[PDB]
Amino acid sequence: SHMDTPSSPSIDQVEPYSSTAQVQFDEPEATGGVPILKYKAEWRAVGEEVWHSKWYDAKEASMEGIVTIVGLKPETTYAVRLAALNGKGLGEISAASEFKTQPV
Numbered sequence: 001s002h003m004d005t006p007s008s009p010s011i012d013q014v015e016p017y018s019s020t021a022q023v024q025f026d027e028p029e030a031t032g033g034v035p036i037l038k039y040k041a042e043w044r045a046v047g048e049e050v051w052h053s054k055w056y057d058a059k060e061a062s063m064e065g066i067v068t069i070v071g072l073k074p075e076t077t078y079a080v081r082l083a084a085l086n087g088k089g090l091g092e093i094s095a096a097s098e099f100k101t102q103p104v
């Protein structure tokens with residue numbers, strides 16, 4: 001009788017530059033029963049406790065196949081994960097993917 005939140009997106013690869021990175025991902029296998037509305041990316045520098053997060057429109061993300069994370073520091077290793085938002089709320093977070101920003 002009730003829809004749930006989406007299953008997890010999958011991160012394929014991350015293409016990092018100096019202060020930004022392109023996160024390549026797959027849509028959830030299951031929407032949960034109602035449509036994906038937004039994506040949330042969360043990232044943090046490995047070793048640190050604080051997570052940074054940003055919302056992304058579902059339409060452009062799923063069409064481009066990417067979300068772009070910003071405000072990164074050069075030469076630094078990060079963990080990133082993704083979750084889909086539907087009408088019920090936030091779904092399962094993806095497995096974390098680790099990348100390193102390039103040197104300036």
Ligand code: NA
Pocket residue numbers: 010012025026
């Ligand atoms: Na894939």
